[PDB]
Write a protein that binds this DNA or RNA. Sequence first.
RNA 1: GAUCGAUCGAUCGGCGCCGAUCGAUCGAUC
Length: 670
Amino acid sequence: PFKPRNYQLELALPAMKGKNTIICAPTGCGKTFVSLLICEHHLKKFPQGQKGKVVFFANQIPVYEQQKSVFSKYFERHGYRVTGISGATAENVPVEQIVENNDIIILTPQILVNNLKKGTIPSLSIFTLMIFDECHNTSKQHPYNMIMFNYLDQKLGGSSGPLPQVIGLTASVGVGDAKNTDEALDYICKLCASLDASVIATVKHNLEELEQVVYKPQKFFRKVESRISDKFKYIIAQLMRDTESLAKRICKDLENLSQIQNREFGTQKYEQWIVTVQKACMVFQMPDKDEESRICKALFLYTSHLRKYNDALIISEHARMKDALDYLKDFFSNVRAAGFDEIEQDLTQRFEEKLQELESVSRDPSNENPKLEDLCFILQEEYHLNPETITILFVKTRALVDALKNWIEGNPKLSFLKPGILTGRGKTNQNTGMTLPAQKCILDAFKASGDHNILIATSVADEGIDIAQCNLVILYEYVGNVIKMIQTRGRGRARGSKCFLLTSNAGVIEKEQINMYKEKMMNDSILRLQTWDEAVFREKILHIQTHEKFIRDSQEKPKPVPDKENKKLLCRKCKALACYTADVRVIEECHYTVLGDAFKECFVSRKRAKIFCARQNCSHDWGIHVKYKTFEIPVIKIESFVVEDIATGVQTLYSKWKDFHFEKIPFDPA
RNA sequence: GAUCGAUCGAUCGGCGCCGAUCGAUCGAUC
Ligand SMILES: Nc1ncnc2c1ncn2[C@@H]1O[C@H](COP(=O)(O)OP(=O)(O)O)[C@@H](O)[C@H]1O
Ligand SMILES: [Mg+2]
Ligand SMILES: [Zn+2]
């Protein structure tokens, strides 16, 4: 099979002695083989009559599947029962029939957290070796931190029998959130205490052998100047000024709904301001139902158009003007066919008046994004120096991912590129997201073989996913903490690989330099901590654990009070009476629906039949029809309703059903 | 294999929230 290297045996030396250690090593050095060697040494040290029990806490379903596969390929020869439980498994063979019947369990932290919460698993004393893959995720309320909280509550105070040995497989301790070396050392000590670890053993003796396996790529900053002749920006700013003037003429109180003083077009500040104004416009009270409905609908349309224009301006500064124009046209086409209105027709005519000028300006070779020009130049230079490279170009947004894909596919200069999309699961407001097998089949085709030359990922290909050794780590304005910097930089580990960082905003290069200084400070702090004695560090982590336990078990009572009186749910756009609180039924605490014949004639059905408001021109989505065991009763979304009291006139808003505190009557077919 | 609803957690940016990114769990569907 595989032969253990020198550094792979050095990293597993303190773990094989019986002490809780943290294995810090660069990404791609083979920490999985170190964990396998530790598991083999742990399961072979028990005398006759007893038997160990190892649990490997993964973080992702692909990572969990890969770990289960490698553990089965490595351990089924010795005669150990390797198993794995996750979200994909069916409601059968309870965990007590799997944990008490196997030796190596590849688990997910939320499954064990739920099992310890509902009281299925008695305590963590059943296991003998817990291995947390990428233990840097131990944070304020991470499921790793919940398992560690349970372990510490079992250790401190109510001392139970033998406790399992905790071992981390992180790649970076992530001193992020700290300022100087003292705060970095404090954070490292806090993390080692939360994980109950006494050793941060790293490769120090045979460091020359590690460089022949993993190669730290050289960083390359690229500050590009913003465009000067931006006619698209000017036209969209004029349209936004016209829309804001109309909204102010119809409202007369827009300057007092938000506290934002200086709001410039095409920034996140204007987005926050317009979101606050939209959320404050839905809360209106006046003795005129039709007038209030008309005013609120007009204000909702105005703020929706302003937010869409601001999103188009934000997309225009990161991609081509054609992408922002296509986004605006798609939004206008989707909102025009929904509902025709006077304000809607006015805004559509005002937009189509400048549509020809926008089409003429966007289709200009001189009006090209300088960031995209520099990216194309870098790609040309890299693929001309070596035509066998693979790019792992990182992007912040999904819309920007699609824009970069359409730009690469539609560029005569970039004829040698075969782009690939890699997004995350779960639907969004615009995108639908990629599933697990789609991600797997796309990542399996991105390598030196072919069918793919550049993977346009977005914050998903830098956590736990195994990818081929890349030669280009261009970061299209994608920065974060020191952990994210080390994770993305660790993707390209081939011989003679670079890591480009393109940006057009003064401050991103400063943040990347701060992250590099924080990484150097983290390395210095680890080197300083690796010189302390075992007793002093054990006493320090014990004091930190005692303080954390005293702080944690003192404020864990966020108990609310349920509401009793009836409340009505008016629409969010037109503010029409939809239903009351007494008619809202709850199926299984996650299927909030409405029961009543009055509500059936208050929506229109247009995946499954998504419902919309039954008014003249509203087209506001309330919810969707779900096919239950027998019925097809529709569920609603609280993100499209406003709650109004019957006695009082308050109109507070709620983002999720958990914030809405009321008498949740359980659903009943009878 | 493809959805839907709910919930949790982490990260980034901006003024406790908002927007974005990702991960997971629980339930039902085809
Ligand atoms: N002793 C070894 N001999 C051969 N290949 C090894 C050895 N140790 C590790 N590797 C390779 O290194 C890779 C490391 O992958 P993985 O552990 O998932 O990522 P990371 O090392 O970043 O945690 C494995 O795919 C394995 O093939
Ligand atoms: Mg790993
Ligand atoms: Zn409506």
